[PDB]
């Protein structure tokens, strides 16, 4: 079919690689492709260089490192629950200073996780994503003192876990104070430690009259750098002996030590640019030729005094400015934890160096790799920034990798978070999407990288612009930080151009974010595209300019939740971004070079290229993702087909011919229907189920272990006590359900038997079994069964055993068995549907086709959406989408309508006219005139002022059709809807929230250990929480017995719940409640606090709730 | 008043601070055990240091550590650094922690509870329903009313008895 695209704006550059933020970061951190001698001082190499050399006389030094090949490929790691990783070797040499003896060896430090091609990780078989962090960039800042106006705070901030924040403040008593580790002390003391003479400080700070006088203290200058140093040491360390070398050690470690104190490279640069100086190292001072020399302190003090005085060219800082907020990507975070683990390894090294034999010590004996391994593993497992990858659809992964978080280690906590940072700063333009953020507690804290946005080597987000010289717009593209962007007048991307020249007398631009109308002579730069303002998700919403931001947020977020459909289709109205997303996400398989297709299979595509070489591509088939969505690739080519470079070989999940397919294109009518669409509920046609629209494959994995116990071994077998052959029907010889079998709740996936503990067979049970002639067995049925509400076809079985080749399990485990079950999910009532404009709803009704509103030609609508959802929501994009959707229905074409450079009403009207001719003229030729019902509806619409009086029925019907409205017949009556109804094609997705996953119920089930209350959650077969507020509801109703049941009979009252169940199965009314067990737990826990809690009667006599069991 | 000093520190019943074998045969246990173990180790070492006639600095240190141990047991992190398990920054959960807070005994297990005969699901509009009615999915009802259903199954020929009915609904 034909794809017609709108808009005049020609994008100069394409979108940058969208996963580059992960990929280039980690690649930069590892430097695996760089030969060791050519490596830079950045990355894990940096950590090695900071840790080593290790001294104190033995000395352990670092030569170089290397990363080996991964012991296992990614797939094998996924199946075996391994981690995709490379062995890390480090060449070290021990040198005894006195002896001169040098022992050199390459030691094995364990493994490091490798990033996959798509920018994710495989940790213990599960795919994870390390999310970029946003934080305050290190440097020197000047902020208004909130209490006293006219006074300011100078804060010196290093990298996280790189040493203390230092504050500088002019006190009301006139003296300048320094704050370190919450210690306020006169700065002049440290100034003296740096070896500053009063004359130098006087000539330097003299320009500011009142302040430098407050700086002057003669008791300090009467001292010496040594005496001042020891004085400061006594100030920072009460009780600690003021030894000279110890004071030098402490102050050096606090300020001048590069290993203890680190401003980033960015902190270095920003400090330099702000204070107008040049930094030697990344510290605030140095230890040179035996004494200390100042770097940052004096320039900071100078600037602070200058700002306080009012001296021009001195301003406070906007800490929310994106020039002052940087990003820590995967490489930096991983490198950080690497540095920590390395430090621990070093501590161990010094230990062994002191303790070990002096004659023979190898680096292998000195180095224990364990702490480092632990640090890395901990980072990739228990870190908040290490998240379970969202694979629901390819766009979910792509978007997840592009996420930015203000939370995590060294970041904000949601308590400390408050407006000023969840705000949307003007500097977010082109950098951080203003639209896509969570609605709830994380709002503004979790954000998304803009489409054209890039993170520089310093960690600042940069957006592209275009050089404009003399009103001529070049193709030269410049990526600036926010600070650089602030220096220019930047024209909007929609400013009218003839050729490369701007033609308008007046152009709309930004100067430091401020909108301004300027002449073309004033334009320095121009935007690349409206696309650059938003995220990859937001860029997928057509007619975005017609949607309120609040619903754009919802559409964005919800696209992430779209489930891959077997029949999945690209939107009828696209934004033009649909293919790049598929490509960058590595969802689809593409042709490497120009060539010819040799072989096409469900499992394989073999291509012969220009090189004459035969390259075979295996297709991933019905693989289970993290969210249980089926990820499978289907061949889109055929045998003998010629393919050029970058051609599509195969469609992955949610991809139709290389275009992102997140849902279906359905025919909607926008009308109320019998209350079934009330309050956002949605009505759909059974025709959608008939043709398998919104049907999705989901695969669930079940797992069981058979282990060695002290009562005898558990074992996986087909022999299950007290079970018929009907139950073992689908079980194979070994006891595992056979591939292809259909399983329902209660069915056995894997047979397992376990020996019984002392369960001293109830001499009750002894009797029983003896009577029944059947001897009481020693084993019981532990088999893994299909949980309630689940089931499907078994598509896989994995069996690993101890004693099997290449297989070693965790200690005590004899064998592990997994069973993969696939299910085909049709759309059903309660499933969540949504469009890209933020219109979401749960399917409340599925009508048979004959009940559906239909067009006069007999065509029933697919979906009925309530118009009441439009006005308060203010997302009109869906309406336009519908209108155009109508046109493309009858013209049989799809559209690209770029955001903010769109399809416009008149164009849609033209298309609707052509479409109308297609929709009507056909009828007129078919020998049918205008219908009576059509006449009535035309009269009605004529009263509404929709059509002009005096025109022919055809003319009026066309007048309506241009408004996107058509006559519609009630399927139940045959009489038409009194008004003409808006009908057209809309792109609707089936979200990951499905009632099949959420429906849960329990009578009784497992209880908690200590509290004896029901467990929570569906997976545990748990009870719903009746919380304080539910209790308040029952209290407010004055329903005492319902409440008391909630508190006792239905939860933690043991005797009560038992007696209640028995009473109910007997048919008796439920017995009176007893003491809830958790109250006894409270009493006994208060007793453990040495408080005596006594239940008393009206006689003030003790009452025993433990019934003598607790009393001697 | 002197009862505000502890000569004999009470010990919670073990079931309230369980040592339990989880599914895989591995053990999981309450922090209170580790707190109590610190306490008992320090106390015993104190008695042995006393009996052996130790110098005053040592006994002083031991007593201080004993008081801090008791503190950690009753309210952890109340005075001084919170006691943590080896290789973790996580504070151990003491009796005070157990009692108070949103996760505390009162608010979590006392003023509110998880309950039986309860369920949840997605909601859908009811337009055909009368005001006093709600649509309830069949299976949810089968589970929620389950004992009643067993009873009624026995009242008819549907099952020989309750247990047969339940095994039938399995």
């Amino acid at each position: 079919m034909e794809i017609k695209r709108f808009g005049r704006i020609r994008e100069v550059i394409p979108l940058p690689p969208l996963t580059e933020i992960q990929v280039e970061s980690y690649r930069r951190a590892l430097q695996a492709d760089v030969p060791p001698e050519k490596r830079e001082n950045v990355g894990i190499q940096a950590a090695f260089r900071e840790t080593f050399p290790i001294e104190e006389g033995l000395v352990l030094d670092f030569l170089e490192y290397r990363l080996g090949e991964p012991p296992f490929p990614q797939d094998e790691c996924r199946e075996k629950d391994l981690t995709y990783q490379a062995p890390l070797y480090a060449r070290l040499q021990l040198i005894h200073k006195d002896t001169g003896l040098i022992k050199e060896d390459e030691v094995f430090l364990g493994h490091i996780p490798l990033m996959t091609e798509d920018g994710s990780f495989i940790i213990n078989g599960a795919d994870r994503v390390i999310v970029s962090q946003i934080h305050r960039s290190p440097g020197v800042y000047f902020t208004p003192d909130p209490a006293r106006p006219g006074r300011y705070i100078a804060s010196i901030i290093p990298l996280p876990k790189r040493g203390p924040w230092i504050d500088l403040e002019v006190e009301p008593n006139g003296v300048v104070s320094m704050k370190v580790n919450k210690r306020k002390f006169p700065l002049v003391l440290l100034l003296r430690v740096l070896g500053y003479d009063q004359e130098t400080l006087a000539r330097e700070l003299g320009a500011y009259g009142e302040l430098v006088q407050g700086l002057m203290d003669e008791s300090v200058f009467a001292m010496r750098p040594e005496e001042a140093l020891i004085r400061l040491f006594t100030l920072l360390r009460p009780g600690d002996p003021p030894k000279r070398d110890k004071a030098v050690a402490y102050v050096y470690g606090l300020i001048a030590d590069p290993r203890r104190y680190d401003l980033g490279e960015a902190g270095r640069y920003k400090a330099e640019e702000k204070l107008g100086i040049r930094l030697s190292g990344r510290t605030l001072a140095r230890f040179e030729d035996g004494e200390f020399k100042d770097e940052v302190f004096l320039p900071t003090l100078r600037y602070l005094f200058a700002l306080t005085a009012g001296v021009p060219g001195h301003e406070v800082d906007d800490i929310d400015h994106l020039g002052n907020r940087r990003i820590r990507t995967v490489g930096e975070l991983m490198t950080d934890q690497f540095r920590v683990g390395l430090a621990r390894l070093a501590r161990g090294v010094r230990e062994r160096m002191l303790m070990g034999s002096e004659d023979s010590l190898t680096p292998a004996k000195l180095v224990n790799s364990r702490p480092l391994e632990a640090a890395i593993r901990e980072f990739f497992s228990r870190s908040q920034l290490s998240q379970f990858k969202d694979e629901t659809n390819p766009l979910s992964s792509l978007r997840h990798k592009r996420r930015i978080s203000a939370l995590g280690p060294g970041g904000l906590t949601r308590e400390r978070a408050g407006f000023d940072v969840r705000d949307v700063h003007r500097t977010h333009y082109g950098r951080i999407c203003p639209v896509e953020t969570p609605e709830g507690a994380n709002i503004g804290l979790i954000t998304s990288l803009a489409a054209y946005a890039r993170v520089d080597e310093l960690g600042f987000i940069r957006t592209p612009y275009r050089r404009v010289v003399g009103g001529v717009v070049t193709d030269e593209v410049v990526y600036m930080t926010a600070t650089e962007e602030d220096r220019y007048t930047i024209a909007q991307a929609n400013t009218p151009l003839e050729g490369n020249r701007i033609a308008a007398e007046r152009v709309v631009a930004r100067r430091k974010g401020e909108p301004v109308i300027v002449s073309p002579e004033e334009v320095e730069f121009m935007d690349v595209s409206p696309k650059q303002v938003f995220s990859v998700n937001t860029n997928l919403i057509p007619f975005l300019e017609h949607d309120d931001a609040n619903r754009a947020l919802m559409g964005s977020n919800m696209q992430t939740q779209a489930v891959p459909l077997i029949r999945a289709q690209a939107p009828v109205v696209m934004t033009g971004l649909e293919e790049r997303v598929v490509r960058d996400s590595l969802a689809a398989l593409y042709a490497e070079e120009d060539g010819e297709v040799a072989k096409v299979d469900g499992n394989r595509i073999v291509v012969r290229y220009e090189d004459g070489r035969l390259v075979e591509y295996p297709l991933r088939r019905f693989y289970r993702s993290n969210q249980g969505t089926a990820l499978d690739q289907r061949p889109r080519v055929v045998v003998g087909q010629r393919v050029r470079k970058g051609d599509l070989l195969a469609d992955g999940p949610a991809s139709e011919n290389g275009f992102l397919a997140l849902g279906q294109n359905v025919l909607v009518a926008i009308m109320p229907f019998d209350g079934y669409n009330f309050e956002d509920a949605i009505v759909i046609s059974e025709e959608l189920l008939k043709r398998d629209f919104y049907t999705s494959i989901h695969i669930e994995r079940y797992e069981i272990e058979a282990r060695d116990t002290k009562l005898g071994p558990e074992r996986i077998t087909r022999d299950i006590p007290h079970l018929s052959e009907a139950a073992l029907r689908d079980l194979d010889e070994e006891g595992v359900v056979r591939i292809g079998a259909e399983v329902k709740p209660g069915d056995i996936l894997v047979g397992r038997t376990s020996f019984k503990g002392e369960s001293e067979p109830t001499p009750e049970e002894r009797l029983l079994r003896s009577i029944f002639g059947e001897k009481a067995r020693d084993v019981k049925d532990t088999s893994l069964r299909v949980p309630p509400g689940e089931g499907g076809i078994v598509v896989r079985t994995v069996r690993l055993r101890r004693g099997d080749p290449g297989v070693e399990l965790k200690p005590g485990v004899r064998e592990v068995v997994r069973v993969y079950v696939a299910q085909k999910r049709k759309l059903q009532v309660g499933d969540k549907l949504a469009n890209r404009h933020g219109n979401k709803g749960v399917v409340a009704k599925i009508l048979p086709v004959e009940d559906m509103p239909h067009l006069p030609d007999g065509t029933p609508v697919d979906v009925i959406l309530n118009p009441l959802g439009v006005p308060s929501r203010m997302n009109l994009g869906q309406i336009l989408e519908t209108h155009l959707g109508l046109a493309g229905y009858f013209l049989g074409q799809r559209y690209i309508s770029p955001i903010f450079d769109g399809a416009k009403e008149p164009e849609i009207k033209e298309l609707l006219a052509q479409a109308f001719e297609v929709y009507f003229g056909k009828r007129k030729g078919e020998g049918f005139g205008v219908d009576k019902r059509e006449v009535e509806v035309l009269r009605r619409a004529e009263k509404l002022g929709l059509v002009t009086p005096g025109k022919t029925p055809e003319e009026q019907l066309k007048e309506l059709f241009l408004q996107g409205k058509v006559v519609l017949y009630d399927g139940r009556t045959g009489e038409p809807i009194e008004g003409p109804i808006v009908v057209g094609q809309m792109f609707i997705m089936k979200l990951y929230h499905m009632v099949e996953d959420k429906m849960h119920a329990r009578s009784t089930g497992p209880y908690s250990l200590i509290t004896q209350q029901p467990l929570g959650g569906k997976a545990q077969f748990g009870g719903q929480r009746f919380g304080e507020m539910e209790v308040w509801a029952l209290e407010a109703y004055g329903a005492a017995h319902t409440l008391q049941e909630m508190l006792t009979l239905k939860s933690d009252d043991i005797e009560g719940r038992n007696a209640a169940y028995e009473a109910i199965i007997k048919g008796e009314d439920v017995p009176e409640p007893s003491v809830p067990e958790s109250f006894r737990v409270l009493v006994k826990e208060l007793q453990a606090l040495a408080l005596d809690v006594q239940t008393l009667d009206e006689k003030d006599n003790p009452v025993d709730i433990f019934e003598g069991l607790a009393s001697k | 008043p002197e009862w505000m000093i502890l000569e004999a520190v009470p010990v919670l019943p073990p079931d309230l601070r369980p040592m339990v074998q989880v599914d895989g045969g591995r053990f999981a246990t309450s922090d209170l055990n580790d707190l109590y173990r610190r306490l008992i180790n320090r106390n015993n070492r104190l008695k042995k240091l006393l009996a052996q006639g130790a110098p005053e600095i040592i006994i002083r240190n031991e007593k201080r550590m004993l008081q801090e141990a008791v503190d950690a047991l009753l309210d952890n992190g109340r005075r001084g650094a919170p006691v943590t398990n080896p290789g973790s920054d996580r504070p151990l959960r003491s009796l005070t922690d157990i009692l108070s807070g949103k996760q505390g005994r009162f608010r979590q297990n006392l003023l509110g509870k998880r309950v039986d005969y309860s369920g949840r699901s997605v909601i859908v509009v009811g337009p055909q329903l009368k005001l006093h009615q709600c649509g309830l999915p069949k299976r949810m009802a089968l589970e929620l009313f389950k004992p009643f259903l067993l009873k009624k199954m026995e009242e008819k020929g549907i099952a020989p008895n309750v247990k047969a009915a339940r095994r039938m609904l399995e």
Binding site: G239, D240 | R64, M65, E68, G80
Partner: peptide
Amino acid sequence: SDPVRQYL
């Protein structure tokens, strides 16, 4: 305040 410091 700090028990180790005190003891030292």
